[PDB]
Design brief:
It is classed as lyase. Keywords: enzyme complexes, catalytic mechanism, decarboxylation inhibitor, lyase. The structure is a homotetramer of 431-residue chains. By secondary structure, chain A is α/β, with parallel strands linked by helices. Chain A has 15 helices and 20 strands. In chain A, the strands form five sheets. In chain A, strands 5-15-14-13-10-6-7 form a seven-stranded mixed beta sheet, sandwiched between helices. A four-stranded mixed beta sheet of chain A has the order 1-2-3-18. In chain A, strands 16-17-20-19 form a four-stranded antiparallel beta sheet, with helices on one face. The structure holds ligand NMA (4 copies), potassium ion (K) (4 copies) and sodium ion (NA) (4 copies).
Chain lengths: 431, 431, 431, 431
Amino acid sequence: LNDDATFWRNARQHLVRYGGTFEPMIIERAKGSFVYDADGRAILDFTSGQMSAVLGHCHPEIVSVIGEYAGKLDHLFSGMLSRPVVDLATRLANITPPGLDRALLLSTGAESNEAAIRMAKLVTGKYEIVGFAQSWHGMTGAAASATYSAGRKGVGPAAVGSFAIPAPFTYRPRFERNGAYDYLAELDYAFDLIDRQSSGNLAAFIAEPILSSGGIIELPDGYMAALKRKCEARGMLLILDEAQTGVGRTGTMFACQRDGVTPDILTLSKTLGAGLPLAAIVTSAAIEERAHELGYLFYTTHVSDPLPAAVGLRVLDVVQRDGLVARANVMGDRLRRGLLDLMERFDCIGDVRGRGLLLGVEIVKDRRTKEPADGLGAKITRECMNLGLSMNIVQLPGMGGVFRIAPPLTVSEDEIDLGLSLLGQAIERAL
Amino acid sequence: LNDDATFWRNARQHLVRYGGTFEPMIIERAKGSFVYDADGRAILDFTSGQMSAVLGHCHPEIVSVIGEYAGKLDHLFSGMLSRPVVDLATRLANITPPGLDRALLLSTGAESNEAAIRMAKLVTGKYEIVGFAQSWHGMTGAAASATYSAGRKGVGPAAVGSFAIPAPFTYRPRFERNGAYDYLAELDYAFDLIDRQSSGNLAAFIAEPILSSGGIIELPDGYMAALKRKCEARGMLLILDEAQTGVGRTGTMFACQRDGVTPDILTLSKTLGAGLPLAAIVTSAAIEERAHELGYLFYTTHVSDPLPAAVGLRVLDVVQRDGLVARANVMGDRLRRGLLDLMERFDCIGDVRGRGLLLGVEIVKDRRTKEPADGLGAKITRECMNLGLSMNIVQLPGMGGVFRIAPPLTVSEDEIDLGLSLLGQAIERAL
Amino acid sequence: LNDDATFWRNARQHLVRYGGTFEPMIIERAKGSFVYDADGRAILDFTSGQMSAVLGHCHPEIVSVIGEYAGKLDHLFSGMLSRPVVDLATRLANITPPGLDRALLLSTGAESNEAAIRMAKLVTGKYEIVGFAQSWHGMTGAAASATYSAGRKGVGPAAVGSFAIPAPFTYRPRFERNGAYDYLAELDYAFDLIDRQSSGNLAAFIAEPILSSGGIIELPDGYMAALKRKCEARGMLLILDEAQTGVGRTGTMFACQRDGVTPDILTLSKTLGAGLPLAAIVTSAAIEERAHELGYLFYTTHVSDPLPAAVGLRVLDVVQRDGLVARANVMGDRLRRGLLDLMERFDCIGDVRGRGLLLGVEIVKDRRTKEPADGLGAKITRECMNLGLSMNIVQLPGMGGVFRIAPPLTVSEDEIDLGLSLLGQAIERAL
Amino acid sequence: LNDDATFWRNARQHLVRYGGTFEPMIIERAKGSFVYDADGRAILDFTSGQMSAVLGHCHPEIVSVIGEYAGKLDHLFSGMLSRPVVDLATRLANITPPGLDRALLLSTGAESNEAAIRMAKLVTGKYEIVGFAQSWHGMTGAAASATYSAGRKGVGPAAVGSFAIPAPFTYRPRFERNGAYDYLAELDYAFDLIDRQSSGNLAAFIAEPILSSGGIIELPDGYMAALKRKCEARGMLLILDEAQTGVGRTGTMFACQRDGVTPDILTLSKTLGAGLPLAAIVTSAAIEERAHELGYLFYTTHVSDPLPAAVGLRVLDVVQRDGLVARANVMGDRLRRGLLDLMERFDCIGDVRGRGLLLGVEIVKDRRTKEPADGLGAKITRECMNLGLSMNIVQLPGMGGVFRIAPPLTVSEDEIDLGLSLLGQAIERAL
Ligand SMILES: Cc1ncc(COP(=O)(O)O)c(CNC(C)(C)C(=O)O)c1O
Ligand SMILES: Cc1ncc(COP(=O)(O)O)c(CNC(C)(C)C(=O)O)c1O
Ligand SMILES: Cc1ncc(COP(=O)(O)O)c(CNC(C)(C)C(=O)O)c1O
Ligand SMILES: Cc1ncc(COP(=O)(O)O)c(CNC(C)(C)C(=O)O)c1O
Ligand SMILES: [K+]
Ligand SMILES: [K+]
Ligand SMILES: [K+]
Ligand SMILES: [K+]
Ligand code: NA
Ligand code: NA
Ligand code: NA
Ligand code: NA
């Protein structure tokens, strides 16, 4: 039973609490799209852990590579090169759009954004960084100063030169022109302001192609191109954070591919490691060259460590081989439509959005007022659990509770249907 | 041969350069205190990789646990608890001094210091952070603003409220009282200044018990206690960064134990993971409690992930069982004395310092002028390699080149003698 | 002749150049609404110097008081009280709205805003300051960080916690709701953003009732009240900068009176001194009380100096006695209508705005495109001079050249007509 | 009687309290080295007001010029040149050392330092500013961030890039080499630190030749030269703040003349205006030239206003004519020796320092412990008043109470003796 009093005792006694609340169960094993409790109960992992297990839990291929290297090449002096490192660097260079040529292999999302941000500042000689007011880039320093969805308060001043602009949000529009939402005009409006406050040191813009923590907010048609150009005109880099979107999730290997806009620096993480700590940035040769010229510095313990590298490599190998990127679209379509039928039944569902297998469901009270569903979310979330479905709802100012849905690219047709089933039951029972 | 033209081609073409220079060899395998090149040549790893492989490369016990969990419990939704997590948290609570009760499990050194620093600011409501002018805490935001050994230039303003004080350096003293080096008076002097510049927002002091990147600088007798008290009087936390010192390396499980001063927050990393990415902070229940009360937030992808946790646990298990902490003193003594004999032979060696198996050798031209050996270091470093010994020299302003020596706690008597041998040959041949 | 080669030689040789260009004439004397050159030519001062000579140049009453005190009470140790100081403080308390009770007498506009801003931060314990993107508050530190009309570039980082919002600009509207300019919605929109970037330290909002340097931008009906409330809800002070508007200029003794919204802190300057350096802030007793409790500090050489105080007093005496505030409306109306007739004749005039005797004329190319008149301004400005009328045009991003018009409250009907005359001639000749 | 209940009532009711405490008297008139109360009692102004009345109160020559211009040329549009402006600019260029060629005429000390600091940052392209930990430069923004004697707390973050070094203080030395105070070594020590914290953006060093508010601290022999060189090597400007020292006070027209080191920018104020608000900066033609090239901006209401300019001119005229600079040395010597005799009598006097007519007397309990006299100061200060002598004591951390003594350069032999008399009586009566 999950009830083990010693477990919970030691948990209460020795764990630092870092946000939210611990699920009152003890997880003992994980396989495929399922995690299992101490009673053996099976929970459908509709969030891929913390949106990382792209190939699911304990993917035989992953297992082998991990053991294959665990005992052969493990961790090395940061000045030593090895095969997995170089092969991954190359692979990344070969699968990302043209213009992205060089990679640095790290360990975490924030770490990746930090390295990117640092290189941007170096290269440009400037330091002001603009982001979305609903962004999420990490808990560390620079990453955190660019994160506006949460954590800004009670911890002192942000980094000098930090600005934000509103993100384009089609569901709840706020900027109009000739009776319509003109998300571009909004962009122009926003940048004018930026311009008026800048000190003449704009160095980069950092953005997620899809605002995950922000509520599964997809940047609408033409935006990125527009953005890009806004940067171009001001001598700024465009850093795209693809932690949740990279690696096939949204139906393309990378989200920037859909839009057809390649960034100056692209960051990867969660999905690249498939649950293990691997991260990376990829940039153009020129930028790397100038960064070098100027003595760029991003020296760590785990930069260029074989084990992870090796793992990142397998994962790409399999996504490609098993054609998971396509799959994403296919199961994505399946889940999407299923989500729409629920919306057909219940009025508490106000929006179904996302792309591929990165989907969001916005709970609302009045499907015409689009009034946030107060607590209803927690309830549903809660019944999903009782029911055996792991979910995650995000709640932000002025929006309704959002269910972030993101199963494994390896998810099965049956599991999809199964989640959809439990989701409906939880809903009806939650009302 | 390490000469593989495709390897090097792809290395030149796709790797981002993050600091220093890549060793012109290809590493293919690692076992114990050795890493092997593409020709099979064996290199004695006298730096434990990037000072992490505490149990050496591919430690059978580590291997098993990694595989044992790789296929059983891998990565989880950050809200889910598991056994390895809770057991490690407990273990840490049980082996660290009294006053250290709760832990948060992360992935990297900088990440750990960031979480610590963030909690400090939260809890106190202040934001100014003091560190040593020769410090090294990480490449990310807050970690980097407190790092003064390198990387301050060309990347924009540091974090608001950043101060530094000189570290006590017995070899090259600079503060005198009644014809003698009074490192405490220096401390008092230093803090007065701080006090005069603070805005009334001092929140913490962050320090390494032994300045590794700073040149293997050990804080002298009574200092830490003094420091601690300096903080106490100003309502500041004392955060001890034990990334290179924690886990038995300096002869004690933790360096703060020797001095008999327990910090408000203690950070661990490199050594805890033994080459894998595991990190953590440990603090008092009260501080955790208040941090909670105020909504502390340090939510990441890999916080509380079973695999690493599991790995951290084994490592403690083995250090304890195999009595490596003691061993540290014993082989440490061996290596130390060996280092002294070389100093007896060559005049280029000006100091032999450190503790346990964290030793430094300061190369100097005039052993009376204590004039830095210009380039001589690089040479020796270079011959050690040709000879089959991996080394690392650090070079800072106003000091001589420093060889950071830190082999595995699992190192053998013979390997020690072997390194000492090659080290002498490299030296004599370098002159 | 203004041609004096020694004059100009020494001018070129020893003057630091601080902005714009020196008028190629030498001024020898000033009386009423006129300044005279070296040839004796009379120039109508339609800008009241640098918008200060409210009673005109060398106002007999001013002259006497200056001499009356120059030889009786001059400058004192900042701890010594005197009559003029206390009488002025009282007068200000008696003529400003209720809620404004205590005054601090300074020397300059920026100085006044700085003291206000400092007190705000003290009292609230916060430090973030919001202003208009078209604001002007001074060249010194805090004053300058809140100034967004000019000077942000090439001089390093602004003050930490500096934000700006767009000012309501009826002529060139940019925010729409149901096909209309909803300046309030704009306000709400703007503050949401602020809110998302604040670190939880908003302390005050600083605003000019009429954006003078920003292009004579008047805050539209209901705005201030709205603003005020936006602050109220966030525990922020509202600091109103009345340097150009205070002292009768816009038809009321103070501009905040019209709107019927009294600020937490009100600043005065230019007009209060009538060309001499006198400045002041006025606040509520409570705020003063708490500021005191906390040890507010604003100690200077000229704080509470009799001469200026004395001068400030006379000026109030006369504005009141001669009923200049009313007059303002009357001549204001006269000038306004005259400005409209010109607009009736020429297409280059796109807007006539302002209040009282603080008027702006926006030059535009297409009176339907509202396309800025490129250079045309400089030309007109230039012919006004040749013609004997001193003017000032301000040029900002995205707007047309703006003529700031502000004659003395003592201006005569004939002078008004005279300026209007020359203004037309300059225009027609400029085309 | 000073007792006027209405006066005090309105004082309590409408005055903002800005620091310290208001003298319980009402000043009605001021002439020469005396200010008079409401009872007619005469108070010897041993502080020249707030150290400004260099020619004393109501100096006939000053009076005339003020009236002479009050009615002829008063305040002008900042773009208009006039004779007094240009003549003063020239005069300053002619009386300051070589290398100082151009001037900008302002209104206040802080204002002057701000303009200087701003120009420094512009010209260099950097923003970090170093000052003394016992400095005083003004209450406004940048001026205040460089002020470390007081006001750093409770008002939010200082300006980004703010550093301080300890000032050389011969009386209470703290840095030793071969058993002696090596103020230069201290300098070297200090800058090393700075260097380690800078981000590579050091732009200027701002210093008072004599730390007035800091306790009358004179920079010892060779220091300034050393300082200068420290700057030179780092591409930094040296800005000398001569608000209390400029204009003959310390025995030279400017204090930088004694040392024989001319700064890159020199600021003047208090003394230049002789109680009226006039201020200025003086710099080299090159610096002005580059500042211009880059669009330096320091546009205010009172920049280049005739009245004050005119006043500044007379003052120079008289200092020169009446040979007050010499006088300074002569009466200075007189007062100095007189101060020494008191020290001969009382043990509470621990130091007599200063230069010319800018003298300090440090009160101490144990003339061997050099233990600060707790409150004794206030007492003496208090009896001086009862006795008819206005004084000022400054009290800083770790030092004894300091009497800042600075009478008018026009002071008489008898007044000097008179102050010395009362000072002794106050002392003996205070014990
Ligand atoms: C776009 C993006 N970038 C970086 C990160 C954080 O990376 P690390 O937390 O592993 O350092 C997230 C976070 N993911 C969390 C856990 C915050 C989530 O909300 O799912 C992210 O969304
Ligand atoms: C005390 C201390 N704390 C944190 C870190 C960095 O942790 P990560 O680089 O893994 O984020 C080091 C660095 N170690 C490096 C690689 C910089 C080294 O110099 O050995 C460190 O010394
Ligand atoms: C609202 C407001 N507040 C303060 C000030 C500046 O005061 P000081 O320049 O006298 O320090 C102005 C400026 N007036 C100038 C000269 C900038 C102008 O544009 O007319 C101002 O407009
Ligand atoms: C060196 C120096 N520089 C600037 C200033 C301030 O100028 P303002 O206060 O007139 O703006 C002082 C201050 N004088 C005060 C009143 C603070 C004093 O302590 O005497 C100063 O000492
Ligand atoms: K490594
Ligand atoms: K996790
Ligand atoms: K005064
Ligand atoms: K002027
Ligand atoms: Na590519
Ligand atoms: Na413990
Ligand atoms: Na009132
Ligand atoms: Na000169």
